[PDB]
Amino acid sequence: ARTFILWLHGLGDSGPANEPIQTQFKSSELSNASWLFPSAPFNPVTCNNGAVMRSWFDVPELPFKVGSPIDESSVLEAVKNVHAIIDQEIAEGTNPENVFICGLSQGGALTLASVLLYPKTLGGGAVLSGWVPFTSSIISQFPEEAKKTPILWSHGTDDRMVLFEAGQAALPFLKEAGVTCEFKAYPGLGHSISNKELKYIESWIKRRLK
């Protein structure tokens, strides 16, 4: 069956820069999968004093701590673009439970928002070193089926760009929302992707495909 993996890059990065990630998923189950690595528009970014770069949504403050300010309206605009991608792939014949959304840092925050607001259950959302980009006021708007999408959250314990504490803060948020989240901490890892972290995501996607 057709598998679709949408990967969302982090702040200032691009889709093509991250496309080689797919070569790290060498299993026969995942080499069949269709990948998409979109690029965020060029936007001013508040944490960089308005400097323009590829950015999914405005980031008021980086490093991101528990309690850091967020721009909820801007995240919700970015979710619309992600949802258009997902809608198209499903309409073209892909089973929603074969759709996986992954992302790093800003892209992980967007992954979380996009999955939890999508009207259908998806295969899963993999957050790498992200943060929760809205407050608990949004939970009432999570569609019924979205709460059944599993989340795998990966975070380095030594991350000082998006504090590990901010990644841990997603867990009581997801529990309040009724969402199942596996949290995988990576000791000594900072704000980057490790191969062992990607290998675990692959195993998790394979298990979800069942």
Numbering used by the authors: 2 to 211
What did the original publication write about this model?
Similar to the crystal structure of ZmB6T1C9/ZmAPT2, we discovered a substrate tunnel in the AtSOBER1 protein, though severely impaired by a two amino acid insertion (LP63-64) into the loop that constitutes the tunnel lid. We found one insertion (L63) to directly block the entrance to the tunnel. The insertion of the second-amino acid (P64) pushes the following residue (F65) into the tunnel, which is positioned in the middle of the hydrophobic tunnel and could act as a hydrophobic anchor for the lid. The two amino acid insertion is conserved within the entire family clade, well aligning with the leucine at the tunnel entrance and the phenylalanine in the center of the tunnel, the latter of which is in most cases a phenylalanine or a leucine. In contrast to Zea mays acyl-protein thioesterase 2 and in agreement with Cunnac et al. (2007), Arabidopsis SOBER1 displayed a clear preference for pNP acetate. We found B-factors of the loop as low as the rest of the protein in AtSOBER1, and increased B-factors in the acyl-protein thioesterases APT1 and ZmB6T1C9/ZmAPT2. This indicated that in AtSOBER1 all protein parts retained a similar rigidity, whereas in APT1 and ZmB6T1C9/ZmAPT2 the loop had a higher flexibility than the rest of the protein. As previously reported, AtSOBER1 repressed AvrBsT-elicited HR, while its paralog (which we named AtTIPSY1) did not. Subsequent incubation of acetylated AvrBsT with purified AtSOBER1 led to hydrolysis of 14C-acetyl-AvrBsT. Altogether, our experiments reveal that AtSOBER1 is a protein deacetylase.
